[PDB]
Amino acid sequence: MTDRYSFSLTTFSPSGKLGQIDYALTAVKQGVTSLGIKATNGVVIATEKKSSSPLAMSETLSKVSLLTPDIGAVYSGMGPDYRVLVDKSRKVAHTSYKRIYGEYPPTKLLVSEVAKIMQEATQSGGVRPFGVSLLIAGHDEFNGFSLYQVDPSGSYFPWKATAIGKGSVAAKTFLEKRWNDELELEDAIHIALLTLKESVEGEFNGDTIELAIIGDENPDLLGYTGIPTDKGPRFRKLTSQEINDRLEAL
Amino acid sequence: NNYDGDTVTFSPTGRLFQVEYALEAIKQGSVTVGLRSNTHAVLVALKRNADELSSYQKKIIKCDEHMGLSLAGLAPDARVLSNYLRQQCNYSSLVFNRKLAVERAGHLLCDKAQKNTQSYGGRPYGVGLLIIGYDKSGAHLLEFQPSGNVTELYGTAIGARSQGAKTYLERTLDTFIKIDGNPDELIKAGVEAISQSLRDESLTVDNLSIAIVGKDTPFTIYDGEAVAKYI
Amino acid sequence: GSRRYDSRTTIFSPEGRLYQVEYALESISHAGTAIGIMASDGIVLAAERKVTSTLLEQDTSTEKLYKLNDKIAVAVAGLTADAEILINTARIHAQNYLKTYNEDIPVEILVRRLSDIKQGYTQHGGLRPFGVSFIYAGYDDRYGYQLYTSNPSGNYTGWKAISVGANTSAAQTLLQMDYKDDMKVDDAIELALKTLSKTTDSSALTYDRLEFATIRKGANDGEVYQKIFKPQEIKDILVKTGIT
Amino acid sequence: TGYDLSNSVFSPDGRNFQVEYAVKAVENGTTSIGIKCNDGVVFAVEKLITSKLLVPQKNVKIQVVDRHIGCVYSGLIPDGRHLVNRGREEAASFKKLYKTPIPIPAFADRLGQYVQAHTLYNSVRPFGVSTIFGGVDKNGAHLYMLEPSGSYWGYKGAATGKGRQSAKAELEKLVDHHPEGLSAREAVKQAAKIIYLAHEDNKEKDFELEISWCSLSETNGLHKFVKGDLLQEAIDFAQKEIN
Amino acid sequence: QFNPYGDNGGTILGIAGEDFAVLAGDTRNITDYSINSRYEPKVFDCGDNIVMSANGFAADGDALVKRFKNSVKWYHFDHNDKKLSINSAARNIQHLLYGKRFFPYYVHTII
Amino acid sequence: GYDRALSIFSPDGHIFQVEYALEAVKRGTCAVGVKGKNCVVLGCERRSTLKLQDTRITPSKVSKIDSHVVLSFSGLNADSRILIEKARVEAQSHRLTLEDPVTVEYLTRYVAGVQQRYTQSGGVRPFGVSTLIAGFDPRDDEPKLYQTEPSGIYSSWSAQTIGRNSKTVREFLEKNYDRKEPPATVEECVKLTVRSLLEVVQTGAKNIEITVVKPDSDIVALSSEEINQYVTQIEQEKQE
Amino acid sequence: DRGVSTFSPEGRLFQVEYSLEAIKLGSTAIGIATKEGVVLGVEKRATSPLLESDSIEKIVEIDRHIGCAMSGLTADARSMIEHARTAAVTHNLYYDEDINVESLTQSVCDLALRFGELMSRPFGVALLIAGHDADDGYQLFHAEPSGTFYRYNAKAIGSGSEGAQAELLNEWHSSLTLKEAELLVLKILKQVMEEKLDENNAQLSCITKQDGFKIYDNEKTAELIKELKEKEAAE
Amino acid sequence: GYDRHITIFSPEGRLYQVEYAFKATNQTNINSLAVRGKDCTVVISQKKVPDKLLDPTTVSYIFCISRTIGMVVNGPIPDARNAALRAKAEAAEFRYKYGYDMPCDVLAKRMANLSQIYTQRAYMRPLGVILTFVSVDEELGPSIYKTDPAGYYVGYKATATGPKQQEITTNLENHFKKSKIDHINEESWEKVVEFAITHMIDALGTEFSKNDLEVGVATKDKFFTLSAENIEERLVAIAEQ
Amino acid sequence: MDIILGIRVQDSVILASSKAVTRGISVLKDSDDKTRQLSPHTLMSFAGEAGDTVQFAEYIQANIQLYSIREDYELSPQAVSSFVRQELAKSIRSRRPYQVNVLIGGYDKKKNKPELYQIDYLGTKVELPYGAHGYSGFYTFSLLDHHYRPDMTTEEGLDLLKLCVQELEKRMPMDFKGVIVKIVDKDGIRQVDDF
Numbered sequence A: 001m002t003d004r005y006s007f008s009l010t011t012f013s014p015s016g017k018l019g020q021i022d023y024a025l026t027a028v029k030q031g032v033t034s035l036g037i038k039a040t041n042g043v044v045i046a047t048e049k050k051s052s053s054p055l056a057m058s059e060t061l062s063k064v065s066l067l068t069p070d071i072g073a074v075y076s077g078m079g080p081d082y083r084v085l086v087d088k089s090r091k092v093a094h095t096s097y098k099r100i101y102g103e104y105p106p107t108k109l110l111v112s113e114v115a116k117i118m119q120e121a122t123q124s125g126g127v128r129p130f131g132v133s134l135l136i137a138g139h140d141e142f143n144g145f146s147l148y149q150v151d152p153s154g155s156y157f158p159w160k161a162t163a164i165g166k167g168s169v170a171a172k173t174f175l176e177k178r179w180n181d182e183l184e185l186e187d188a189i190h191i192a193l194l195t196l197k198e199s200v201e202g203e204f205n206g207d208t209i210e211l212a213i214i215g216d217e218n219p220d221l222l223g224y225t226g227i228p229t230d231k232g233p234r235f236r237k238l239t240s241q242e243i244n245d246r247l248e249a250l
Numbered sequence B: 001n002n003y004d005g006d007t008v009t010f011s012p013t014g015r016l017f018q019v020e021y022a023l024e025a026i027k028q029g030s031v032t033v034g035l036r037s038n039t040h041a042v043l044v045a046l047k048r049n050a051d052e053l054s055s056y057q058k059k060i061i062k063c064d065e066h067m068g069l070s071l072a073g074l075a076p077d078a079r080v081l082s083n084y085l086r087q088q089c090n091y092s093s094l095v096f097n098r099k100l101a102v103e104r105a106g107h108l109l110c111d112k113a114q115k116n117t118q119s120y121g122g123r124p125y126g127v128g129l130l131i132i133g134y135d136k137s138g139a140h141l142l143e144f145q146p147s148g149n150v151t152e153l154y155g156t157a158i159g160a161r162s163q164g165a166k167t168y169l170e171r172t173l174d175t176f177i178k179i180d181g182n183p184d185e186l187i188k189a190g191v192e193a194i195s196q197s198l199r200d201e202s203l204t205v206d207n208l209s210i211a212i213v214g215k216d217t218p219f220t221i222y223d224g225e226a227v228a229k230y231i
Numbered sequence C: 001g002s003r004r005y006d007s008r009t010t011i012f013s014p015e016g017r018l019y020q021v022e023y024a025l026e027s028i029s030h031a032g033t034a035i036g037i038m039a040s041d042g043i044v045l046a047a048e049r050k051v052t053s054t055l056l057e058q059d060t061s062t063e064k065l066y067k068l069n070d071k072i073a074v075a076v077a078g079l080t081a082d083a084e085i086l087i088n089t090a091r092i093h094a095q096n097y098l099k100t101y102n103e104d105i106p107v108e109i110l111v112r113r114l115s116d117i118k119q120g121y122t123q124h125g126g127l128r129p130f131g132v133s134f135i136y137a138g139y140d141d142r143y144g145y146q147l148y149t150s151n152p153s154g155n156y157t158g159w160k161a162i163s164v165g166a167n168t169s170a171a172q173t174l175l176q177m178d179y180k181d182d183m184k185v186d187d188a189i190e191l192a193l194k195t196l197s198k199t200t201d202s203s204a205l206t207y208d209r210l211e212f213a214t215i216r217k218g219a220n221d222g223e224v225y226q227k228i229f230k231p232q233e234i235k236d237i238l239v240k241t242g243i244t
Numbered sequence D: 001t002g003y004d005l006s007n008s009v010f011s012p013d014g015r016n017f018q019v020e021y022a023v024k025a026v027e028n029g030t031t032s033i034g035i036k037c038n039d040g041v042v043f044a045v046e047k048l049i050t051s052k053l054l055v056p057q058k059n060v061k062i063q064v065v066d067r068h069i070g071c072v073y074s075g076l077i078p079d080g081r082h083l084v085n086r087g088r089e090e091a092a093s094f095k096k097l098y099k100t101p102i103p104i105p106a107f108a109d110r111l112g113q114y115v116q117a118h119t120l121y122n123s124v125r126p127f128g129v130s131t132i133f134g135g136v137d138k139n140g141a142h143l144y145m146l147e148p149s150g151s152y153w154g155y156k157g158a159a160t161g162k163g164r165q166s167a168k169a170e171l172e173k174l175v176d177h178h179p180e181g182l183s184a185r186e187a188v189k190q191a192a193k194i195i196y197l198a199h200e201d202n203k204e205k206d207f208e209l210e211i212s213w214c215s216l217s218e219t220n221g222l223h224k225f226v227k228g229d230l231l232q233e234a235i236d237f238a239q240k241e242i243n
Numbered sequence E: 001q002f003n004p005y006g007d008n009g010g011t012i013l014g015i016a017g018e019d020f021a022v023l024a025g026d027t028r029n030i031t032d033y034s035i036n037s038r039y040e041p042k043v044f045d046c047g048d049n050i051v052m053s054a055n056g057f058a059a060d061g062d063a064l065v066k067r068f069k070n071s072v073k074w075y076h077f078d079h080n081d082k083k084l085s086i087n088s089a090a091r092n093i094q095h096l097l098y099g100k101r102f103f104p105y106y107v108h109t110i111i
Numbered sequence F: 001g002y003d004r005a006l007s008i009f010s011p012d013g014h015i016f017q018v019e020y021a022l023e024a025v026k027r028g029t030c031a032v033g034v035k036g037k038n039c040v041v042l043g044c045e046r047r048s049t050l051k052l053q054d055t056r057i058t059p060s061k062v063s064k065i066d067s068h069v070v071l072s073f074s075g076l077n078a079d080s081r082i083l084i085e086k087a088r089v090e091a092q093s094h095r096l097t098l099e100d101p102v103t104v105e106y107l108t109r110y111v112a113g114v115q116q117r118y119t120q121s122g123g124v125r126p127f128g129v130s131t132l133i134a135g136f137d138p139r140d141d142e143p144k145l146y147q148t149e150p151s152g153i154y155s156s157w158s159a160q161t162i163g164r165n166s167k168t169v170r171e172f173l174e175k176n177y178d179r180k181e182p183p184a185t186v187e188e189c190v191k192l193t194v195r196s197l198l199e200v201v202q203t204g205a206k207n208i209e210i211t212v213v214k215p216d217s218d219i220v221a222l223s224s225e226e227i228n229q230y231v232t233q234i235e236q237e238k239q240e
Numbered sequence G: 001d002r003g004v005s006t007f008s009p010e011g012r013l014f015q016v017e018y019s020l021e022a023i024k025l026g027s028t029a030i031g032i033a034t035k036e037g038v039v040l041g042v043e044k045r046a047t048s049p050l051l052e053s054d055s056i057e058k059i060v061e062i063d064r065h066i067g068c069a070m071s072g073l074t075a076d077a078r079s080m081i082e083h084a085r086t087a088a089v090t091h092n093l094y095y096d097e098d099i100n101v102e103s104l105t106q107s108v109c110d111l112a113l114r115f116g117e118l119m120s121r122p123f124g125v126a127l128l129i130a131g132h133d134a135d136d137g138y139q140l141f142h143a144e145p146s147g148t149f150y151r152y153n154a155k156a157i158g159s160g161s162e163g164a165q166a167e168l169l170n171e172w173h174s175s176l177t178l179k180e181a182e183l184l185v186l187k188i189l190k191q192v193m194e195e196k197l198d199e200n201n202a203q204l205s206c207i208t209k210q211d212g213f214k215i216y217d218n219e220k221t222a223e224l225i226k227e228l229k230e231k232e233a234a235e
Numbered sequence H: 001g002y003d004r005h006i007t008i009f010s011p012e013g014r015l016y017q018v019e020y021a022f023k024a025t026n027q028t029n030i031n032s033l034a035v036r037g038k039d040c041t042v043v044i045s046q047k048k049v050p051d052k053l054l055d056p057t058t059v060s061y062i063f064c065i066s067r068t069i070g071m072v073v074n075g076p077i078p079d080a081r082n083a084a085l086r087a088k089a090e091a092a093e094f095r096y097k098y099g100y101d102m103p104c105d106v107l108a109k110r111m112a113n114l115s116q117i118y119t120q121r122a123y124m125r126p127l128g129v130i131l132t133f134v135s136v137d138e139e140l141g142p143s144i145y146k147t148d149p150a151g152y153y154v155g156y157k158a159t160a161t162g163p164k165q166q167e168i169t170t171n172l173e174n175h176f177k178k179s180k181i182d183h184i185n186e187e188s189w190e191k192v193v194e195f196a197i198t199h200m201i202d203a204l205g206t207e208f209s210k211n212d213l214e215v216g217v218a219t220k221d222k223f224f225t226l227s228a229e230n231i232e233e234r235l236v237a238i239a240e241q
Numbered sequence I: 001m002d003i004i005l006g007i008r009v010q011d012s013v014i015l016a017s018s019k020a021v022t023r024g025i026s027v028l029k030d031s032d033d034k035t036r037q038l039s040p041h042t043l044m045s046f047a048g049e050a051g052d053t054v055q056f057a058e059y060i061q062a063n064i065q066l067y068s069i070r071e072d073y074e075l076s077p078q079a080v081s082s083f084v085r086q087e088l089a090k091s092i093r094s095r096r097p098y099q100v101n102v103l104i105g106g107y108d109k110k111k112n113k114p115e116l117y118q119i120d121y122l123g124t125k126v127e128l129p130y131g132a133h134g135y136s137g138f139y140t141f142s143l144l145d146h147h148y149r150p151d152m153t154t155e156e157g158l159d160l161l162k163l164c165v166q167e168l169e170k171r172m173p174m175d176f177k178g179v180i181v182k183i184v185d186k187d188g189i190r191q192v193d194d195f
């Protein structure tokens, strides 16, 4: 009844490869396509709701998760690993930041904390790396809008736009052609839906697509009034109806 | 073969090879005999020397005034187990003002040996013990094996060539059980039993080790010229 | 038990080498080249980014050059995630020293500490070493301008000019050829960029590929300034030296 | 291959081969049985007389837990003793907190969860015993049998060890021929017979019968060993049935 | 407040002769103004031709004597049934007593 | 914690990890210790594969443990820092409790004990380092030179070398060092130390470091030019 | 790989048996017990002529009444000696007496099997523990890394041990004097040593009731070597 | 090939021990089914008592986790009971700490997160079980949530688990394709149980007696299992129409 | 320990420290040096509870000496005082605090300036031109307020210090048995043997 695995399960091979990180990236490659596009006045993150059964209620399975009121995350790879990372990411945003400074962390620092957790699974005793790549979109007052990718290694890079998982090579080429530095949020959502259609085989609608935005402050979604310093969450998950509306103008 | 690397691995036929290899260390160890009547219990031990310059390795250890054992196999493991018995005998005395039952002593040794067979890192004990004692239900003799199996017996022997002594006792069973109120005759039967397990060497004065416990006899060990009487 | 699956990261080969340290150095040899050049009036840190994509947001990006305190900076070669663990430890040691002695940490003391941490992972604990090589650029009032490097073994050494990462053999020959002791920061800037321009595995060296920094004692009134170069400023210095 | 070298490793089948190897140690052991009767349970065990030097009625195999539960097992005898020692701690801590003596289904899961826990890690070995146990609680009589995997079920009759097929066949007749039920004193006699019939698989060495029982009428719901005249009456009944 | 100590009274007396020694003690055990027992032995044979008494608080006295007797038993086990000399016994008792330096045995001991 | 037994016996009675630690010492740059009548000199090789080095700030091969004792080494550099730190701490702890600085033998014995502890502790590998510990005991004018090695054995030497090609320089010292009459002066002792390194080093004076230790905490490191004068005088006498 | 505390199919601990092989590679150490004292002698075996041979400490004091000689990986003995010394001094503190030589030996041997996955491997060194006490007189013990100890009238350990033990077999009798035992240790050392025996590559010691444990001066040993040569030339 | 013995990535990006834990799921050779009514959630499972010596009352793979939550397991019983005891403990702890009864979906998530840990941490093996949780949640209404050895979990309109799950799944898929609703439009749970049994009979192609089935029913504020006689009443009604 | 004075002049720091060691009824010693050399150009005098004083001083001495060997470099008086303060500030919230007050007199070889730090057992650090601990300051600060000038020579500092000691000998009740005086300057630490 002992944890005897106090030694690394990820080690350097003779060629200089960290095998388990590479294999974790292979697992991410098999995963469903997700993407992120940064506009001037917002960020959009999107992915396919790959339903394991038609009897399953795919609404319950949220691939796109709120981390803070102004930061959202989406993934490609192993869903369970993602779910526990979101739980730790949400908690670390409080313990290591909000409870100290009285405000939510900026996107880059929350990303750094997530990255740190993923790095530790890459060096600590008796654990495999996480088998996910995350795309974290967010906004903060001094950095503005931002989009980050986080790999199984713990490495993270900021993107203007990118895609991960199944059809990422094709999707990244598509985004390179369409992206410019003068995009409005609606233009980015339009491009996101176009890019995502290429990697999707079957049905393509608001029920089989999950899409969220980091945009303007939503005082309607706040739940309370009387505090002018709190203007409401910038993160908003688009409804099944809201997606279908934009698919008619596609 | 592939399933003998540690104590935590069953073989495909349901065997624990490390326990069986520990069992093998006992067979390599020097012979010792245990036997009892209704009044007394006797340990007789053939001690082994390294060469002619060396002393003869002590086989018999006292656990309490009314209990003790003889060892065959790894002597350091016998020391660990005997010390554990000494403590349990002592705990019974101090806390309950009660001499530890010999049957209960065997149960404690079994359970201590067992923990080493089921857990990783540890090894089985590499020693077999013959515990004699006189408690509130008379004379007793136990045989401990490091698998955990403890067995109450009239007589037995463990170690190299112990099957010779064990057959003799199996024949003599009805005679030596009746040797009541006569320690010297019970020791004689033990010395005659251990003689069946000898080849080439014979029982000399610093070779032989005898112990006895009984009705009005504390556990006492006899070595040297004290055992010359019985050669 | 568990023993079966243990790589045994902290053992000697028959030749007397630490397997994992050697393989971590092999890992680092594939990372983007980082160059440190120390002049009489400052230090230059130049480094090549690995992931050229047009969509990478370069102005908010930091994979190579990090700040440890106001006086000391590092250039990284290897796993970025591993380096950031060590960087945050180094940042803490510097502030612990400041809190204790009310003086800024001497460069060598900080370097030794990080190097001692790296060493620990090679001798005990059964964990893989950090796949990181640092170039430390710094200043203190004892030794003035200092360049060091540390590697996964925990060994550190001082330098006048040095490279880590990819093509260090080629890079170190080119530096050894054109370096001189009386050199100045503006000359070292030019040498650093010329060296990367020749040793790069890319077709051409551009601003979007580089991280660049200078530690000068050429601030207002004899203080020291750390300048991490912005993308536009790296683009200007590339035109100035005549590479683009 | 190599899936059988470490405990807690799923083979490609979905099996834990180390647990199946622990079952072989159980199958190698002596026969032990359990019979559920009207108001209680009866346990019995085959004790092989290796030699004449074994003291009769001394090397007791059946163990009591608390005052109301009997346990008997086949396989590695020390592993059984270890499991009973645990059971006693579980039964003690249950009584300490909840006052009432541990119910038999509750007690069964306490052993079950513990034995199952030894199939979760490579740092421990599975138990080399199938354990037949039971007794009388507030909801009446209960007989259980617990395997190396941690699997257990309630039984009308239970049997394990080398003579299990022989015993199981005999138990299956009793279940068919007594649907209204078997009395406690009947079950003691039948238990003796079944151990005697199951001794044909271990027929080389002669043996010693040991029986125990919990019964609401015959023992006030407490575990007791069958001794003296009642034991001899059962031995005579068993000796008559084989001839 | 709970007071862990008490006073069970009594008196003891050791006298060393030329080739003998005596240790005497009264057999009365008391608390306050009540007699607990008129015969409660206080001077004990500890084996190895040593006699001991720990007069004062009877619980600490019994505890100490019990521990010393046990110390004699373990001295035999650990040193090949060697006789514990009276000087060695004395030093062994010093360590028993000082072991509880910050929660003392409330007894005056004579051997 | 990580508890794995890395240093263990092999069928032929060898602890391979301890022997493979000696191979790391064999790879290390040469170090030599020669004791005169009223001095000890520690010579060290500096490999010339590394030019563009900053010799002001690079870790020097000889380290002061206290004001009266020095420690040079051959083997893994990172490992040597751990021994030097522990030794320096123990040197101050001895002053603090004994009111007297360590003897050279005591300091050696400690460092050797630390090295031994790592050969039979779980989860750790041996130090890939052999040391030469040199100095003078407090209020004593007899020179002291000791050697340690990964296994944890230590011993006293009139002169000794460790590291790469230490076989060759030990050969040299075995014929050139006389016990009945050691190097009487500092000059003679330094000269014999430089000469012995010149057998292996195969370059002028940048590759040789010399540290002279004298009684009563008088330690001084020679400069390039001072060493280069010895190199010049040796080869001019050799041309004959 | 395989467990450190694993049993072989013959019923022996692999690591203990392999540590015994390391002890065979060690330098020779000989002990001879008599009624006038116990003599301990060792081969020093300096690896080079520049090694100052008086710094080779293979014979060691545990208490005034207990000495110790070693053979094998002699670095491993330092913690064993430390434990012995502490045990000897601690027992004097608790009991106001000298500690029995057997009890001291037993205390040392308790460390031996404290290894697993406590220390990571057995000791690679055997000890000859010689002493005197009032109960059992002059005693010589051989303490192994198995945790076993045997008492001996005489014993050789190390590289020349089986050859030396055969020689000790013939030569030892119960009426040996101390002076005879000294020469006998020197005789058997000179036989099994590679290099020629002198006062600088071999050391003697003894333990007597009066004077306690004494390592012999090189001048004293040199006279005993000269006395030996003459008595061997004498017939 | 030690990448197949512990929970680490193979070169393909696969965890073979997780995949072999899924195979252990079908070792019992039992098929389960769960469907939702208006006011209820019904779970049925095959009951196979091969030995005549077994007490059939103790042979069960349905567990009452809390008053509101029920759980059926597809897999070996020791792992099933490991999971059952933990779920009970978690549900009780939840109520104590947060002051309301643990929701079905939240328990499913919690157990799924525990399962995830066994796939990432090497010393723990995955449990060889698929846990189907059922309740009538006070916020969400009738609920089916399923957890597996991968640590995956999802809500269901209806579900099936076992060797012949695909046949049962397609049978249910086809029914909901007709009705065009997420549930069995039926008032009484008794008729929802009758539906469940009927559609398992059709899918598996086997008839059932009272001792071949095992039924669990979740209503508002209690989950309970049906006795053999309660099931017999159900079987009589099915046969009579 | 009773009186410890410190005075920073132009080019040096002067520390005067009483010689008496009194335990209750009797004066056990009249030649006690209540100071430790931490480094060649840094001296720390101390006063406070018996035992704690020396234990603390020697503990600080060992740490500064360890730093000196490790870096082959002498810490500045400012750095040493900051180290000492932190140790006392850590101490005050311990199970059993060090009851020790100190003066740290040092010559900063970099800045070529004498420096005097006064630190109490709480970890209250202050740089001063002249300092004292305990009851000494009640008499001596008013003197030094009157007679002190920053540009004083070492001889003038010593004359000013005699006037402080004379005033303490006149008006204090305890016989502190005179003072041991030590000067810290660019050349290091030396003791004035006649005072």
Ligand SMILES: [Cl-]
Pocket (backbone or CB within 6 Å): H109, H110, H113, H114
């Ligand atoms: Cl959770």
